[PDB]
Amino acid sequence: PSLFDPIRFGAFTAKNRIWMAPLTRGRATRDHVPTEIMAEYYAQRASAGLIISEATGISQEGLGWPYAPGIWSDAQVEAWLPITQAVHDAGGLIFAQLWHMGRMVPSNVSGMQPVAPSASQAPGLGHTYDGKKPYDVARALRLDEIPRLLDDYEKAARHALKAGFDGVQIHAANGYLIDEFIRDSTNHRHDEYGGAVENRIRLLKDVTERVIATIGKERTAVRLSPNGEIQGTVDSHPEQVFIPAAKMLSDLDIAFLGMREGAVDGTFGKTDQPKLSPEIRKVFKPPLVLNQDYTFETAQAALDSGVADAISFGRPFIGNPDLPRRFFEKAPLTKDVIETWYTQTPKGYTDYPLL
Numbered sequence: 202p203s204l205f206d207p208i209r210f211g212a213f214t215a216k217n218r219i220w221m222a223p224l225t226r227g228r229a230t231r232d233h234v235p236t237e238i239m240a241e242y243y244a245q246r247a248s249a250g251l252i253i254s255e256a257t258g259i260s261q262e263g264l265g266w267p268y269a270p271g272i273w274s275d276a277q278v279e280a281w282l283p284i285t286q287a288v289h290d291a292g293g294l295i296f297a298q299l300w301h302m303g304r305m306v307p308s309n310v311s312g313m314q315p316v317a318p319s320a321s322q323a324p325g326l327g328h329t330y331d332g333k334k335p336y337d338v339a340r341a342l343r344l345d346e347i348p349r350l351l352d353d354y355e356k357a358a359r360h361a362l363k364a365g366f367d368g369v370q371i372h373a374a375n376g377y378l379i380d381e382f383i384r385d386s387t388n389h390r391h392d393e394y395g396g397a398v399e400n401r402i403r404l405l406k407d408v409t410e411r412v413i414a415t416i417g418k419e420r421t422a423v424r425l426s427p428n429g430e431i432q433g434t435v436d437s438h439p440e441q442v443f444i445p446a447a448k449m450l451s452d453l454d455i456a457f458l459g460m461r462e463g464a465v466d467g468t469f470g471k472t473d474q475p476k477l478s479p480e481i482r483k484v485f486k487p488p489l490v491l492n493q494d495y496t497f498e499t500a501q502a503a504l505d506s507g508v509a510d511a512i513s514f515g516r517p518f519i520g521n522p523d524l525p526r527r528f529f530e531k532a533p534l535t536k537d538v539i540e541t542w543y544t545q546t547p548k549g550y551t552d553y554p555l556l
């Protein structure tokens with residue numbers, strides 16, 4: 202397959218195999234309501250086969266990123282309409298990334314204590330509405346709270362359809378809530394959601410089954426990050442836990458699995474925990490979309506091997522609205538301005554020229 206060849210996935214055909222990775226940009230409101238400028242931003246990049254949205258909070262409890270959007274309220278759904286409309290006018294497809302940040306939710310943002318599989322304090326400093334602050338002490342989510350959490354995911358997934366998204370991708374990477382349950386450095390639970398591999402993927406499983414029951418498998422995607430430590434989340438033997446995860450996901454027949462894979466020389470994830478896509482390819486039958494550090498040449502190499510069906514691009518899409526065109530034209534890629542990744546205005550957001 203050619204990077205430029207269409208791909209069938211779920212209920213859809215993407216126009217190409219050059220996809221937009223989920224990118225948190227912070228151009229929504231303090232109260233996590235999307236804004237008009239986000240529509241232009243996404244429209245510019247509609248040549249992406251699929252745009253995966255920036256991470257979108259499923260509830261205030263799960264949303265701790267300042268000026269990131271949520272999707273739990275009616276006013277949020279309404280504000281998303283112009284964004285999805287724009288994408289579909291430009292002929293493109295967009296999935297919503299559904300986001301529970303777990304232990305990484307700053308109380309300055311959510312207003313409450315963050316929840317996690319297990320009690321702990323995330324290392325580091327979180328972005329807030331008054332500067333960086335260190336993270337709070339999370340509480341271990343009670344077994345009797347999992348029914349609620351699932352309803353939070355259900356509401357969010359239906360709200361995504363109302364907002365005009367083609368479907369959802371469940372954020373289960375990068376050290377946020379689901380990924381904390383999966384990995385043995387963060388999951389120290391004694392009940393049916395911790396200890397054994399099947400217990401550790403149990404939240405992933407039930408949240409996936411609840412989304413599938415709400416909006417159909419053909420609109421339901423998952424993100425994982427099985428290799429390399431991130432935000433104090435790592436597993437001691439990731440092959441033991443992520444391969445069974447990938448097989449459980451494949452049996453549900455989700456629309457695609459996206460994964461960000463760290464590398465020894467990785468620039469958004471550095472690690473010698475090796476990449477598990479080769480082993481995950483063998484158990485995961487639906488489309489497998491690989492990410493992190495791909496060039497045009499390495500992305501097509503991955504397609505040529507069959508290990509990837511598509512590749513998402515992150516920072517390249519930030520400064521290169523029309524990446525696919527720049528690829529085939531052999532046009533230099535504009536470099537993204539790191540300082541403006543997460544500021545609040547149009548500068549370094551919608552002001553990168555197209556070709």
Ligand SMILES: Cc1cc2nc3c(=O)[nH]c(=O)nc-3n(C[C@H](O)[C@H](O)[C@H](O)COP(=O)(O)O)c2cc1C
Pocket residue numbers: 222223224225226254255256298372374375424461469492493494495513514515516517542543
């Ligand atoms: C500014 C920025 C924002 C990001 N936001 C998200 C996000 O909302 N959800 C997510 O899963 N990953 C996010 N990521 C990780 C990226 O999707 C991607 O995995 C990373 O950019 C590596 O891919 P690349 O080398 O193609 O850029 C983000 C990365 C960057 C640099």
Ligand SMILES: NC(=O)c1cccnc1
Pocket residue numbers: 224225256374375
């Ligand atoms: N999921 C992620 O890794 C991420 C990174 C930065 C901002 N938002 C989300």
Ligand SMILES: [K+]
Pocket residue numbers: 325326327328
């Ligand atoms: K941080």
Ligand code: NA
Pocket residue numbers: 285286287289365
């Ligand atoms: Na639309």
